[PDB]
């Protein structure tokens, strides 16, 4: 792997790795309490042996610049972070894959960037969501304080998350956990749109998801394809991420 840095629209440095390959260029977008190490740890990366893989750390996570404000964590800023990565590698065609909120990011990048030929959203749908201000602020307080990593660890353990997902939370600065959480009140509630007719949009979730309605809504509204994995919940579906990688590799082939 090679490392890269790019600068987002607002000056934030965005750092990542490039794993060269002869195949399609795939850009990987992690979730809120994660960093780019999840792709190797989950087995997703080994499922794409031929692809040119680009994996960034979103702002405030991993090796990328610190933010520390809620508006700095607005959805539009993460979209700018990903588009900067698309600029550095100069391709006309990219396939994006995002986990959890990273899926929402990938969908929004697809809406605005005609270089995105495919976008895959793992365990996130594309529809409008009502965000309860009070509960999100409460969660920001929990995650940003001294007990914040333990709060997330305990929650994800108790819901059967894979170990890599449990462990990743402790690698995120508590101040950025709080700011990213508050950032969800700045634009993340809106639905995403289709960027252009030829785009391939894929949503992935647990067959046991308690709320499949918005996933079906995306099939209808966006012409998205819905992929199911065997799991009772979205968190547990993350145990199937390597398997999903193999299915992505079948599309890219």
Ligand X SMILES: COC(=O)C[C@@H](NC(=O)[C@@H](NC(=O)[C@@H](/N=C1/NCC(=O)N2CC[C@@H](C)[C@H]2C(=O)N[C@@H](C(C)C)C(=O)N[C@H]1C(C)(C)C)C(C)(C)C)[C@@H](C)c1ccccc1)c1nccs1
Least gap, CB of 226 to ligand X (angstroms): 16
Least gap, CB of 51 to ligand X (angstroms): 25
Least gap, CB of 214 to ligand X (angstroms): 10
* Cα four-point dihedral sign 25, 30, 36, 39: negative
Q: Which is nearer to ligand X, 6 or 32 (CB)?
A: 32
Binding map of ligand X across residues 13-52, x = CB under 6 A, - = no contact: ------------------xxx-------------------
Can residue 141 be called a binding residue for ligand X (CB under 6 A)?
Answer: no
Residues 90-109 that bind ligand X (CB under 6 A): 100-101, 104
DSSP state of 58: P
Least gap, CB of 238 to ligand X (angstroms): 8
Q: Which is nearer to ligand X, 53 or 143 (CB)?
A: 143
Can residue 136 be called a binding residue for ligand X (CB under 6 A)?
Answer: yes
What does DSSP say about strands 94-99 and 52-56: parallel, antiparallel, or unpaired?
unpaired
Q: How far apart are CA 108 and CA 202, in angstroms?
A: 13
- Interacting span for ligand X (CB under 6 A) from 40-48, 129-137, 194-202, 220-228: 129-137
* Cα four-point dihedral sign 148, 8, 72, 156: negative
Conformational region of residue 170, where left means phi above 0, alpha means psi within -120 to 50, and beta covers everything else: alpha
Angle of the 174-183 helix axis to the 148-158 helix axis, nearest 10 = 70
Q: Which is nearer to ligand X, 19 or 44 (CB)?
A: 44
How many degrees, rounded to 5, is the angle at CA 197 between CA 196 and CA 200?
90
Residues 171-230 that bind ligand X (CB under 6 A): 181, 184, 188
Ligand-binding annotation for 155, yes or no, is no
What does DSSP say about strands 200-206 and 94-99: parallel, antiparallel, or unpaired?
unpaired
- Interacting span for ligand X (CB under 6 A) from 56-64, 84-92, 125-133, 216-224: 125-133
Q: How far apart are CA 8 and CA 251, in angstroms?
A: 30
Least gap, CB of 253 to ligand X (angstroms): 29
Least gap, CB of 239 to ligand X (angstroms): 12
Closest CA to 218 of 192, 197, 238: 192
Q: Which residue has the tokens 């987002």?
A: 8
Contact of 26 with 51, CB cutoff 8 Å: yes
Q: Summarize as ranges the residues that interact with ligand X (CB under 6 A).
A: 31-33, 100-101, 104, 124, 129, 131-132, 135-136, 139, 143, 152, 155, 181, 184, 188, 234-235
């Amino acid at each position: 792997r090679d490392v890269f840095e790019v600068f987002s629209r607002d000056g934030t440095p965005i750092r990542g790795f490039s794993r060269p390959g002869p195949g399609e260029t795939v850009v990987l977008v992690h979730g809120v309490a994660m960093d780019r190490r999840i792709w190797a740890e989950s087995g997703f990366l080994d499922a794409l042996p031929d692809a040119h893989v680009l994996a960034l750390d979103l702002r405030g996570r991993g090796e990328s610049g610190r933010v520390g404000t809620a508006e700095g964590h607005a959805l539009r800023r993460y979209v700018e972070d990903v588009r900067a990565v698309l600029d550095r590698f100069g391709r006309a065609r990219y396939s994006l894959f995002g986990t959890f909120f990273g899926g929402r990011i990938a969908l929004q990048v697809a809406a605005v960037d005609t270089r995105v030929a495919r976008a895959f959203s793992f365990c996130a749908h594309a529809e409008q969501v009502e965000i309860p201000e009070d509960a999100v602020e409460e969660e920001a307080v929990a995650v940003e304080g001294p007990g914040g990593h333990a709060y997330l660890r305990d929650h994800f353990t108790g819901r059967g998350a894979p170990p890599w997902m449990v462990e990743a939370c402790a690698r995120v600065d508590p101040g950025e956990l709080g700011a990213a959480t508050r950032g969800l009140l700045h634009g993340s509630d809106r639905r995403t749109e289709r960027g252009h007719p030829d785009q391939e949009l894929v949503l992935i979730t647990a067959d046991g998801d308690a709320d499949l309605a918005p996933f079906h809504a995306g099939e209808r509204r966006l012409g998205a394809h819905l992929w199911l994995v065997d799991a009772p919940t979205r968190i547990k579906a993350a145990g199937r991420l390597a398997e999903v990688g193999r299915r992505v590799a079948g599309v890219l082939a």
